[PDB]
Design a protein around this ligand. Sequence first.
Ligand SMILES: CC/C=C\C/C=C\C/C=C\C/C=C\C/C=C\CCCC(=O)O
Length: 269
Amino acid sequence: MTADLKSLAKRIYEAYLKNFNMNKVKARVILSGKSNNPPFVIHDMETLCMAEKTLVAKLVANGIQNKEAEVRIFHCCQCTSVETVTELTEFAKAIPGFANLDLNDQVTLLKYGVYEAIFAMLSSVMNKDGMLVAYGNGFITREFLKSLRKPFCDIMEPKFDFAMKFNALELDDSDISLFVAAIICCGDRPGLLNVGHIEKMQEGIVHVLRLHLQSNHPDDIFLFPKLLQKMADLRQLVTEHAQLVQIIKKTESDAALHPLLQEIYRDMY
Ligand SMILES: CC/C=C\C/C=C\C/C=C\C/C=C\C/C=C\CCCC(=O)O
């Protein structure tokens, strides 16, 4: 007559496999070079423009009215975030207690948590040379993103830096699913109404995470505190990312921000 924490961990993992279009196994199969619709490599302007014509044709169907390359890239980044936000919102229903919260608290938790979760999961599609994009159908190089004009070259590099260290922890999907659930369940988000119930939701999911890591990673006795630190690092990465997005908003008139993301950023930090 106790909670079955192993079963809860499996429920979380299954919800993550169902709700996210990309997972670490799927990404690694693509990244390894394994036969139908392999990713198109974007390493320079020529290959960016070829990939766009095949994979996002509408965005470049405007002739002389097409936006600048960097702005098109930023638009594609935002489309990816909007999709991942939708996936995270459905995933969160699997977290014990989340769907029992008031709707406004669900919204606040997702508002602060989504970009932390986005950058954690992005590590799964990154290696030291580049990252998968467009539902696994493109691979854009880290050097190409660094070559973009300021401020757009400053978007991805800190995320690659985070990812290389995160990937060295050698987490699998069963671990990452619980880490993402724990990110969402933070009782210290600004503006929460029912802090007490959220704190107990957080305690429960972090307990599931700690026990799972103990079992799944017997070789790394500090993995749990390492991941607690990664959550704090992600909060700082998101604060800095939001500051850069605000610079883009103020100084780049063509880089329209999608309304869902503007709402996430509004009053965030
Ligand atoms: C063929 C063109 C398609 C894709 C290549 C262009 C851009 C890369 C796409 C996605 C990159 C992945 C994640 C985006 C990272 C940070 C989010 C920045 C925008 C935001 O603040 O929501």
